[PDB]
Amino acid sequence: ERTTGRQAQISNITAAKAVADVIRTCLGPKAMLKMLLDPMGGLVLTNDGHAILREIDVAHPAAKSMLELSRTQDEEVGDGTTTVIILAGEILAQCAPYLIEKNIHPVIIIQALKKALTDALEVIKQVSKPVDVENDAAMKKLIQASIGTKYVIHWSEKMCELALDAVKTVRKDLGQNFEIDIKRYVRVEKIPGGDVLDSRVLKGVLLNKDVVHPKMSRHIENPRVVLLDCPLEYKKGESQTNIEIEKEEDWNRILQIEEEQVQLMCEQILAVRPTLVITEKGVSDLAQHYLLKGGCSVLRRVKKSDNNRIARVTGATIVNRVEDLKESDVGTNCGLFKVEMIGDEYFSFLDNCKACTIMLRGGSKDILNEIDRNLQDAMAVARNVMLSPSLSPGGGATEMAVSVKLAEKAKQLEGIQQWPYQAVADAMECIPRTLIQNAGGDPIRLLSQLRAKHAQGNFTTGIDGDKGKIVDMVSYGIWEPEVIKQQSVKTAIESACLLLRVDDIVSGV
Amino acid sequence: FNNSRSDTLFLGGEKISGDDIRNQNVLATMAVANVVKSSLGPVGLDKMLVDDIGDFTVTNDGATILSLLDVQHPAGKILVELAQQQDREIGDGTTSVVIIASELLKRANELVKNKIHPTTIITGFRVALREAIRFINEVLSTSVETLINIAKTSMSSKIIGADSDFFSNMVVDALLAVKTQNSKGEIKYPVKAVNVLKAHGKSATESLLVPGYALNCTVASQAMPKRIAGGNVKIACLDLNLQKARMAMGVQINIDDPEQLEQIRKREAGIVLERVKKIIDAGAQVVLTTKGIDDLCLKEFVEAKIMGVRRCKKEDLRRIARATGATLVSSMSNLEGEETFESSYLGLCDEVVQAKFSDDECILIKGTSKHSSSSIILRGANDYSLDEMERSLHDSLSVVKRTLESGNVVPGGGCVEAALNIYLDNFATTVGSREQLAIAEFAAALLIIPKTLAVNAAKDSSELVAKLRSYHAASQMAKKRRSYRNYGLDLIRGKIVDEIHAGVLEPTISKVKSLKSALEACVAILRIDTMITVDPE
Amino acid sequence: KTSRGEIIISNDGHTILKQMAILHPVARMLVEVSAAQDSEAGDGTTSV
Amino acid sequence: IVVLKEGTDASQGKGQIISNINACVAVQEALKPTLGPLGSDILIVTSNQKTTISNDGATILKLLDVVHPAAKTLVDISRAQDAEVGDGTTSVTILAGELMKEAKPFLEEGISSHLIMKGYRKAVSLAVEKINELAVDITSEKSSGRELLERCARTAMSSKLIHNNADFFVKMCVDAVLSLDRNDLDDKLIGIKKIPGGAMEESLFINGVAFKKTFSYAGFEQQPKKFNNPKILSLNVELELKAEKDNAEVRVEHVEDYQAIVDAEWQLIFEKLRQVEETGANIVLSKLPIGDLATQFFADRNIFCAGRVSADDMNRVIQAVGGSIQSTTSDIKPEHLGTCALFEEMQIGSERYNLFQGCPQAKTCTLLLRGGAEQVIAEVERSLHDAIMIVKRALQNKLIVAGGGATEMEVSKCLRDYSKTIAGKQQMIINAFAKALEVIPRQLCENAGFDAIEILNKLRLAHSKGEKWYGVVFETENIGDNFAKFVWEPALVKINALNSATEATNLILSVDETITNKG
Amino acid sequence: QNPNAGLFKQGYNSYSNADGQIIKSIAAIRELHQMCLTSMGPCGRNKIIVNHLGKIIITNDAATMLRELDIVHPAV
Numbered sequence A: 001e002r003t004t005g006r007q008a009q010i011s012n013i014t015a016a017k018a019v020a021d022v023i024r025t026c027l028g029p030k031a032m033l034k035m036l037l038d039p040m041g042g043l044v045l046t047n048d049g050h051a052i053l054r055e056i057d058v059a060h061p062a063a064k065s066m067l068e069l070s071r072t073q074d075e076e077v078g079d080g081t082t083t084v085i086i087l088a089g090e091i092l093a094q095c096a097p098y099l100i101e102k103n104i105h106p107v108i109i110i111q112a113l114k115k116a117l118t119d120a121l122e123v124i125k126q127v128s129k130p131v132d133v134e135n136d137a138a139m140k141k142l143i144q145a146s147i148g149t150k151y152v153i154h155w156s157e158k159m160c161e162l163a164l165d166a167v168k169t170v171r172k173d174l175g176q177n178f179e180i181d182i183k184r185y186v187r188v189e190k191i192p193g194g195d196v197l198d199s200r201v202l203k204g205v206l207l208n209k210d211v212v213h214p215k216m217s218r219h220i221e222n223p224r225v226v227l228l229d230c231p232l233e234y235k236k237g238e239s240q241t242n243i244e245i246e247k248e249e250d251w252n253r254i255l256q257i258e259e260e261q262v263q264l265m266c267e268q269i270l271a272v273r274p275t276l277v278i279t280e281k282g283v284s285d286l287a288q289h290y291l292l293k294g295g296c297s298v299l300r301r302v303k304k305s306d307n308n309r310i311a312r313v314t315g316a317t318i319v320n321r322v323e324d325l326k327e328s329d330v331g332t333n334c335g336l337f338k339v340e341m342i343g344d345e346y347f348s349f350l351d352n353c354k355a356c357t358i359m360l361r362g363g364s365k366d367i368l369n370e371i372d373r374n375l376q377d378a379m380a381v382a383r384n385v386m387l388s389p390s391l392s393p394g395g396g397a398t399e400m401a402v403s404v405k406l407a408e409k410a411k412q413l414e415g416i417q418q419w420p421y422q423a424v425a426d427a428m429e430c431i432p433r434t435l436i437q438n439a440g441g442d443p444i445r446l447l448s449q450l451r452a453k454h455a456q457g458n459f460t461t462g463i464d465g466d467k468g469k470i471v472d473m474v475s476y477g478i479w480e481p482e483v484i485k486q487q488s489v490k491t492a493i494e495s496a497c498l499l500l501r502v503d504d505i506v507s508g509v
Numbered sequence B: 001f002n003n004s005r006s007d008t009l010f011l012g013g014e015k016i017s018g019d020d021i022r023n024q025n026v027l028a029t030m031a032v033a034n035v036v037k038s039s040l041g042p043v044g045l046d047k048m049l050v051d052d053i054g055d056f057t058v059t060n061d062g063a064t065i066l067s068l069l070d071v072q073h074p075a076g077k078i079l080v081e082l083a084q085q086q087d088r089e090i091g092d093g094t095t096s097v098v099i100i101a102s103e104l105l106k107r108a109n110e111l112v113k114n115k116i117h118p119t120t121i122i123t124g125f126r127v128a129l130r131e132a133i134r135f136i137n138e139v140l141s142t143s144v145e146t147l148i149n150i151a152k153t154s155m156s157s158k159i160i161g162a163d164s165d166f167f168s169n170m171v172v173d174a175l176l177a178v179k180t181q182n183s184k185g186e187i188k189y190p191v192k193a194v195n196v197l198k199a200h201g202k203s204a205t206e207s208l209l210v211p212g213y214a215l216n217c218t219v220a221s222q223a224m225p226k227r228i229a230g231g232n233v234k235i236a237c238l239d240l241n242l243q244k245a246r247m248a249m250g251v252q253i254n255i256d257d258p259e260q261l262e263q264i265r266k267r268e269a270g271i272v273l274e275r276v277k278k279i280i281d282a283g284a285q286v287v288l289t290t291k292g293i294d295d296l297c298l299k300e301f302v303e304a305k306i307m308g309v310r311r312c313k314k315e316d317l318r319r320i321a322r323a324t325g326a327t328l329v330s331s332m333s334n335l336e337g338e339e340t341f342e343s344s345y346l347g348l349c350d351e352v353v354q355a356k357f358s359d360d361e362c363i364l365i366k367g368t369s370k371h372s373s374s375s376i377i378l379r380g381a382n383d384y385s386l387d388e389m390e391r392s393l394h395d396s397l398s399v400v401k402r403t404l405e406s407g408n409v410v411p412g413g414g415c416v417e418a419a420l421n422i423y424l425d426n427f428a429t430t431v432g433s434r435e436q437l438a439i440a441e442f443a444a445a446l447l448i449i450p451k452t453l454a455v456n457a458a459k460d461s462s463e464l465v466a467k468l469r470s471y472h473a474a475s476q477m478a479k480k481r482r483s484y485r486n487y488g489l490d491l492i493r494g495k496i497v498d499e500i501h502a503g504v505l506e507p508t509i510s511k512v513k514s515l516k517s518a519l520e521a522c523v524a525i526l527r528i529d530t531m532i533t534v535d536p537e
Numbered sequence C: 001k002t003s004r005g006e007i008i009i010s011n012d013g014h015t016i017l018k019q020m021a022i023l024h025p026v027a028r029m030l031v032e033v034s035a036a037q038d039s040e041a042g043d044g045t046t047s048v
Numbered sequence D: 001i002v003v004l005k006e007g008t009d010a011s012q013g014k015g016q017i018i019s020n021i022n023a024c025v026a027v028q029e030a031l032k033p034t035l036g037p038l039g040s041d042i043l044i045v046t047s048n049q050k051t052t053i054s055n056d057g058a059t060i061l062k063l064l065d066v067v068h069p070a071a072k073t074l075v076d077i078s079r080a081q082d083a084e085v086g087d088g089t090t091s092v093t094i095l096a097g098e099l100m101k102e103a104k105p106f107l108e109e110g111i112s113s114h115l116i117m118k119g120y121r122k123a124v125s126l127a128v129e130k131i132n133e134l135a136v137d138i139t140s141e142k143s144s145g146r147e148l149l150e151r152c153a154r155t156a157m158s159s160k161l162i163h164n165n166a167d168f169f170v171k172m173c174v175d176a177v178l179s180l181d182r183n184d185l186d187d188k189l190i191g192i193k194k195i196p197g198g199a200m201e202e203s204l205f206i207n208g209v210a211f212k213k214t215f216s217y218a219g220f221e222q223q224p225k226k227f228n229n230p231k232i233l234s235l236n237v238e239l240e241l242k243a244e245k246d247n248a249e250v251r252v253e254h255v256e257d258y259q260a261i262v263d264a265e266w267q268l269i270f271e272k273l274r275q276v277e278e279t280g281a282n283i284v285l286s287k288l289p290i291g292d293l294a295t296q297f298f299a300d301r302n303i304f305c306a307g308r309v310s311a312d313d314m315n316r317v318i319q320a321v322g323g324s325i326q327s328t329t330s331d332i333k334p335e336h337l338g339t340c341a342l343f344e345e346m347q348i349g350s351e352r353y354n355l356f357q358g359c360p361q362a363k364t365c366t367l368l369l370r371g372g373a374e375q376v377i378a379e380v381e382r383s384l385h386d387a388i389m390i391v392k393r394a395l396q397n398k399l400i401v402a403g404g405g406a407t408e409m410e411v412s413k414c415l416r417d418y419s420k421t422i423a424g425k426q427q428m429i430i431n432a433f434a435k436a437l438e439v440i441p442r443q444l445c446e447n448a449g450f451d452a453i454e455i456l457n458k459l460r461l462a463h464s465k466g467e468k469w470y471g472v473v474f475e476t477e478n479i480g481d482n483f484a485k486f487v488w489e490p491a492l493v494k495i496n497a498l499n500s501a502t503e504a505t506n507l508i509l510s511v512d513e514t515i516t517n518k519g
Numbered sequence E: 001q002n003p004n005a006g007l008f009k010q011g012y013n014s015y016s017n018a019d020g021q022i023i024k025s026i027a028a029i030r031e032l033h034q035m036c037l038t039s040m041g042p043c044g045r046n047k048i049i050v051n052h053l054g055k056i057i058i059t060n061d062a063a064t065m066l067r068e069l070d071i072v073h074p075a076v
């Protein structure tokens, strides 16, 4: 029913702490795969944090808040998902003692944490170095960084390629910020089989819809594309259109009219001399015929999302009513119209030998979803940099810097206001630690050394994954988008600040 | 213990009389109040309220806690509907109008147990209020920034308060910018404008205050522009829908000759198509219908790079239009014609852009002819905190609309309470009798706010409550020297301070209605002596 | 608190008796005399 | 997945302490009406089905079952009060509760309980001494030896069903505290008897001793049923042929031995039997049987008897006729027997009652009670034990205080005045206890109807402004000198009361976590 | 759907420490600790423990409270 007092507080903290506990063995280069079972049927074999926590229903309110943190974070940057959860926990946990043990009110611990966040954020931008968003080589060895710790690493280079080759493709600066809608303009397409490398980033689209009529062009050299909303069949009246006939030879009259309007429609289209007509709706058998000899291949039923991406790699602006069909609505700038038959399943291409279609190949419909998600992380950190050319010391280095500059300051602040501040510092340290642990090396040992080396000797010094020894980032490098280090710490400290505002929990609508 | 039986007077239900019921009422009000007595003050804290599905919401808005908390029992609902009155009237002061009410009953009841008729207690509380309301105008004052202050102290018991300075500013700013004259003078600050939005991402501080308005929509067809105008734009705030007509509900198209079939048919498309043209042909670069758009009659806007948004919030267009000076086009007519009248009905806006916010992406009409308007957009950790950020951004930003509309504030900090207390307390002897105990109780009862404002800090609040007590008790000795009421509590530090100086301001209009109201309840309940509960069906 | 669940408060007898749920037949009779006290005087429904 | 208690409720917190207080308040408010001269009375029909009606607050709080730990202490301190004193039981709880009530404000405002506990602690100490300080010791200070026991058994017998037949019972009450040796007042001697029927005052005070009529054997109806100075033989065991119990084996191989052993049995009895006759007695009583043959014998030679007398009876029988129990019939010497002034076998309330009335040499009386219902006789016996027990503790302590709220109201004065000199936390707490004592005067007025507010308030003036015995004129509703009006109660009550009442109050204020185990 | 392995004993509950058990236990202890942490000292408070046979008990002492309770956590 009800639970006021530290009772509340505790269960919240423990709850939140437990959330972390699950995916903590998923943060690191040697991170394991949490094969989860969804209710609907299938499975999820991913190790990408947010993709795990999504597939786990929780009860305790805090555990629900803690769980959605991984989502809002997966919405800002594509990466840094697992990290925010672990941090968001350790913060609450590291407050636990001064929260009750040292009887500090939640207002005070909040007043400090909100303060320690800003200072902490400084130390992030302070250690961050900028980068050439255009230097293909830098972007690659940047995207590569956030491809490690995932099944997609055995082709790491191959991945950053398909990543950049797609981030830049749908990009479109615009200024009067840079707009990169990976979502609506980079439709992926996972096709079972082949090899990983056998996957490319076609600059166009790929529909499996075949051709409306047999004897129709399998591939127009340079096709003239015409995209339209409206269907291709005899329309009807949006009023009480009811016909009364007693005039004998009138049946034939009307029944004919239908053929007649389908004709007109074919005309208006055929007019601008098209070779490829792709409509979102249907295609009357009649209309097929008049578009056959009219000289063009037809494609019926294609999703809006599928269509509007075509209209960016054909230029062919989509148009509804045909009696208004302009000639500006061309089909210029569009290579071939291949129709490769991929294992008993016909496809259609529209490459040009603004929106690309990443086509992945692996070894199962299952294994592909691993790739797709892994790729998304790549293609997202690429976008981040595109809109914030700043990077942060990976290997948990940044995380340790903030640990010290804060630890130092806290110790030199004096007042009850110090303890909560001190905790944010002590908290931060958990990431290089989770890393060192999931590496196998001795946490107490490596950290003391990493922390010390940090205290003076440079701040771009994190821990090396497969190794387990402290290395300098600059050295073997593994910087990550500075944006990630923003959110991870922004919302984590917020989460903590929210849950700490709770002193009572109640049940009933 | 436990009431029971019937014997005579056969009634289709329950019926408690006297002591039994009279206590039940007091217990009721008590419980419903005590749930939210731990949310009072800056040191007060929020709570999570889970349903049956498991979801929940964390919030300090006493009125929503009592709303969200299922209350079954008259005297329980009463204080949940009284907590409502406040949030509906002034807009803040909920959590407190209840705590007072409960305290008045609880107390008044005690007097009855002492053998003091309910009425004699009632008139007594009535006079304690007359004197108390009057006196309230002897601590208040005209606006002499008091605004960024009011807006701040109203965020103490809230989540938005850790970043007080920030929002306290964004609050007044946003509101002010929207003021109007309603009808015949007035000059009322929109009790609801400033479309507030929220989106998870970034810091709590990174909340933007649009320099115009935020309409929450995309752009119909992805084919049209996502940003238009840098200098000037013509906004078409419609209402009528641009989709393929359907004629009168009772207009059968009876065809006798196969000829007319095709003709009247395609006519349908054009009828509502002409309507489209007569609008583009006005300089319309931005169209904001309310009743949606066709995809046919959209391509017309697209072919012409006209940002045209479908089925918008009509509650926004009404304000998007007063803000671009435009006109909410109900239907192009005027006398007997048809046109959206080129720029006659259109609005002048500086720029219409579709800004993104991670996941989401909405439209902004920033900078306009006669807009003045604003709109805030919260950004937090997740929806749980976000709902609440706004939740209290409102319970705060409301305190401002009233400080404005009513130029008069009083020093909060549990000062008002303390003052009234000792004044009414001493004043209580100005009638003596049994009636003394009444006023006395009334006054004494008010010290609930200062006590509980502090007890929410764990420490032995008997300290401050004593100090603050004494002070006023003394100040009203030549109330002469250098009279100094306005002395409230500073729980953050644990000492009595001058709240007017410190910056703890609250509009008079609140504590004046919060009081007159809470008693109106207590009395209607004080008169309750038998509760007949009919059996339902 | 009526059968419907609507809550009411008053000193007007005719209205308390009316909404009271009196069961005995000759008992219901009182409500009618208080009813008529309301129909002629309009006051004293309690006293009658 | 693990646990630490197996589904067994347990609450804690600050509310926990408040729950307990209120809990006790209930059990408290329950008895508040049974207070004062014009006090209401209760009718409890326990789950037992036995219906009772009384005012002994102890007896009520004993029939309420009550399981709440906290609130259950009010049941304990009420029982002790009916022990170390015998009266005031109703009040020990009213106060005990009331204090806990006045502790709420502090506990709520956010004050330590250890501080409230201290505050009340002094308050009692001071209040207790103040009573000792007013405990008007007398002896012939215009009070007399009997007028103290009367004047005190009276006021205390007020507010009980036995009231309007006061005089009758106080004269009866005192007479029975005196019946026993004033050197060792043992209740167990005043043995009471209840007789179905009769007026609630047609009750009889036996000077010697009275007991049932266990006389369950044939051959009775002979034996005079009345003697003046009979020679009572307070014998302890047997008087049956074959013996009532115990045996052995008789094995004989001779026909004559059979008839021989028989004649022996008989003579074996008869002898022991005449052995009693030899004592030259008129009344032969025994805590064991008196067989058909036995009682038949004495019947022949006009000697009266009774077998199987109540154990606790023979002891009052001894103390009446001054006999002395004898187990065998052999060494029966004459200082062993006893003699009263008069013996008779009554037919009181359709029930024959052997009674040895008139015994100027007794140290133990007996008294039969009457009533129109087994509930009223029952309430008398309890309304009278509350008096007898107060007369008894008024011999041992000729120290008395005028109640009727006075003592209570005054002890408030000095306590409230004292708090002035303290100031602060201890001020309010000790000043609270002072006000908390006002409950007895307060309630006492509400119960009867007097203007609780005015009569109280008017008392505070005059009492604090002098008159250290001003209480409440039960008669003309107004304040008055209850010492002058003769409303006396030994100080032994109030002193035990406030000690023991507060005990409960801090015992509760000390508990922060109550863990009820289930099972 | 989900399988289950390596089981051949009877229906027990094995809390391997490699599952953050040491802390699960610290928890259980942490709970009964707070009960004793306020009973110590003159400023200590009492607790009313109500017997599993139903008897009231009030004591400042710690070894007694614990005795009268139905503890179950092995680490406790």
Ligand SMILES: Nc1ncnc2c1ncn2[C@@H]1O[C@H](COP(=O)(O)OP(=O)(O)O)[C@@H](O)[C@H]1O
Pocket: A026, A027, A028, A029, A031, A048, A049, A079, A080, A081, A082, A083, A084, A145, A146, A148, A149, A393, A394, A395, A396, A397, A431, A435, A463, A464, A465, A466, A478, A480
């Ligand atoms: N190559 C590596 N060697 C050491 N640390 C790495 C390496 N790769 C990722 N990191 C660090 O581990 C974290 C990223 O791990 P990951 O498992 O990808 O979690 P997320 O889901 O948040 O990306 C960051 O702190 C990053 O600095």
Ligand SMILES: Nc1ncnc2c1ncn2[C@@H]1O[C@H](COP(=O)(O)OP(=O)(O)O)[C@@H](O)[C@H]1O
Pocket: B039, B040, B041, B042, B044, B060, B061, B062, B092, B093, B094, B095, B096, B097, B153, B154, B156, B157, B158, B411, B412, B413, B414, B449, B453, B488, B489, B490, B491, B504, B506
């Ligand atoms: N800065 C402050 N310092 C002391 N008291 C404050 C301060 N801020 C608000 N208060 C007081 O706290 C109470 C309002 O808090 P809250 O719990 O939000 O009540 P409501 O929810 O009814 O506004 C009022 O007594 C107000 O005067």
Ligand SMILES: Nc1ncnc2c1ncn2[C@@H]1O[C@H](COP(=O)(O)OP(=O)(O)O)[C@@H](O)[C@H]1O
Pocket: D034, D035, D036, D037, D039, D055, D056, D057, D087, D088, D089, D090, D091, D092, D155, D156, D158, D159, D402, D403, D404, D405, D440, D444, D472, D474, D487, D489
């Ligand atoms: N004659 C009386 N006039 C005024 N007060 C009386 C009188 N008789 C007894 N009292 C007071 O009434 C209270 C005793 O109440 P009672 O109903 O007798 O229960 P108990 O004696 O068991 O507490 C005490 O305050 C006692 O002093």
Ligand code: BEF
Pocket: A047, A048, A049, A050, A078, A079, A080, A081, A082, A146, A149, A377
């Ligand atoms: F492992 Be993370 F989501 F890239």
Ligand code: BEF
Pocket: B060, B061, B062, B063, B092, B093, B094, B095, B096, B154, B157, B395
């Ligand atoms: F919670 Be309150 F109404 F500010």
Ligand code: BEF
Pocket: C011, C012, C013, C014, C042, C043, C044, C045, C046, C047
């Ligand atoms: F109660 Be009455 F009808 F005024």
Ligand code: BEF
Pocket: D055, D056, D057, D086, D087, D088, D089, D090, D156, D386
């Ligand atoms: F009820 Be009391 F023992 F006089």
Ligand code: BEF
Pocket: E060, E061, E062
């Ligand atoms: F003094 Be301890 F509780 F044995």
Ligand SMILES: [Mg+2]
Pocket: A079, A080, A081, A146, A147, A149, A377
């Ligand atoms: Mg990553």
Ligand SMILES: [Mg+2]
Pocket: B092, B093, B153, B154, B155, B157, B395
């Ligand atoms: Mg407020």
Ligand SMILES: [Mg+2]
Pocket: D087, D088, D156, D157, D386
């Ligand atoms: Mg008595």
